[PDB]
Design a protein around this ligand. Structure first.
Ligand SMILES: O=C(O)[C@@H]1C[C@]2(C(=O)O)C=C[C@@H](O)[C@@H](C2)O1
Ligand SMILES: O=C(O)C(=O)Cc1ccccc1
Length: 386
């Protein structure tokens, strides 16, 4: 050999699902997380760039068999099924199986006796140790199984489910991200699982990986990384997404303006925009100066997109577009919705955004905008206030 093939191809290909913070999370076309760092470190060690190849729990083992990637990670537990189709590295994290519940329900689910009752709505992700644990150790509970992380935690906050039993490190993170939730005794779990890297059936390759991984464990680098990634400002994702979507919508603004011969810059509608933003943002307890800086940057980024598209259409001598939505009617509602999302997310994240020491993490969290492909200058101006 596998090493031979990786050398000859010039890339380490790494399968991951990118929906399991803090191991592996997709921000745009970017992946970030503890397992992403590990992959990039192993690649560097092997003398090649890394390529992250997205996959999903249902196609994980198939994609692996189809040769879509060399190794797989992303908070992958050692299970017997996965063992039958490859080798695992040595484990780099031993983690507990423990509950996360609405905080007011914490005392109701501290024992497996309480949990394993006919009344209990237990949700879990499919195909791994959590589902095996739930079916085995809480069979008297009503069990539902979901492929999407967001859905499980939303279900628990919103009262559609009662608890999840999952890795302790997830309970720790989600307790922070979803303040209505509490991990239940995560340091003293019901059982343990081992996180490892899924490797091909190549004993020599495994020896190289194991040698590298054990050095990183012994040196404290893995523990250091776990701690940083658990502390990472994952709650910035809605703010990144609102910025990115607002900016991508400027393509539609530009199409509509081109058709009716409207100037790009409209300092009147700009005043209305900043004014409504300052009003709503002030009700959220955000300082007016924060708000004005951020939205002035968003408006300028938008015009930069518009001007670049007009510049292309001018040279190409483009006519009218039939794929052009109504500006005042349907685009500006969307813009207003995204403005609200951006303000609410700023408010949720105000401590992180106020901490100079976090700038590097904030950069990592926010820099991956799809809109960059559309305009690198616009992307930089949108992110400049942060
Ligand atoms: O006319 C427009 O609608 C768009 C949107 C914009 C904004 O992003 O809010 C507001 C006013 C205009 O100057 C620019 C930026 O074009
Ligand atoms: O791999 C498993 O065994 C799992 O069940 C762990 C898990 C936890 C949360 C999201 C995805 C996978």
């Amino acid at each position: 050999h596998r090493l031979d093939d990786i050398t000859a191809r010039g890339v380490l290909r790494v399968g991951t699902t990118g929906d399991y913070k803090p191991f592996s999370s997709r921000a745009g076309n970017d992946f970030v997380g503890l397992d992403i760092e590990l992959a990039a470190d192993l690649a560097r060690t092997l003398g090649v760039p890394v390529q992250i190849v997205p996959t999903s729990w249902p196609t994980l083992m198939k994609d692996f068999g189809d040769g879509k990637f060399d190794i797989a990670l992303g908070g992958v537990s050692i299970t017997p099924e996965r063992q039958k189709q490859g080798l695992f590295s040595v484990s780099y994290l031993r983690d507990g199986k423990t509950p996360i519940t609405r905080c007011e329900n914490s005392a109701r689910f501290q024992t497996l006796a309480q949990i394993d009752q006919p009344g209990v709505r237990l949700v879990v992700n499919p195909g791994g140790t959590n589902e095996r644990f739930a079916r085995s150790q809480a069979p008297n509970a009503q069990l539902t199984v979901y492929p999407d992380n967001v859905t499980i935690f939303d279900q628990i906050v919103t009262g559609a489910a009662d608890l999840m039993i999952t890795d302790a490190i997830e309970t720790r993170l989600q307790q922070r991200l979803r303040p209505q939730l509490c991990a239940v005794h995560p340091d003293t779990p019901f059982d343990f699982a081992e996180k490892a890297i899924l490797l091909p059936r190549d004993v020599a390759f495994k020896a190289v990986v194991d040698k590298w991984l054990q050095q990183r464990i012994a040196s404290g680098a893995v523990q250091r990384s776990v701690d940083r990634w658990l502390d990472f400002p994952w709650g910035l994702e809605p703010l990144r997404l609102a910025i990115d979507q607002r900016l991508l919508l400027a393509q539609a603004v530009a199409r509509a303006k081109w058709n009716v011969q409207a100037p790009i810059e409209d300092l009147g509608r700009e005043a209305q925009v900043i004014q409504a933003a300052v009003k709503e943002g002030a009700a959220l307890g955000l300082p007016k100066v924060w708000i004005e800086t951020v939205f002035r940057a968003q408006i300028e980024a938008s015009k930069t997109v518009q001007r670049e598209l007009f510049a292309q259409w001018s040279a190409q001598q483009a006519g009218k577009f039939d794929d052009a939505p109504d500006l005042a009617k349907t685009i500006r509602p969307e813009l207003d919705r995204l403005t609200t999302q951006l303000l609410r997310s700023m408010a949720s994240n105000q401590t992180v955004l106020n901490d100079e020491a976090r700038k590097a993490d904030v950069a990592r969290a926010m820099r991956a905008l799809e809109a960059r492909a559309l305009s690198p200058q616009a992307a930089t101006q949108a992110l400049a206030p942060f």
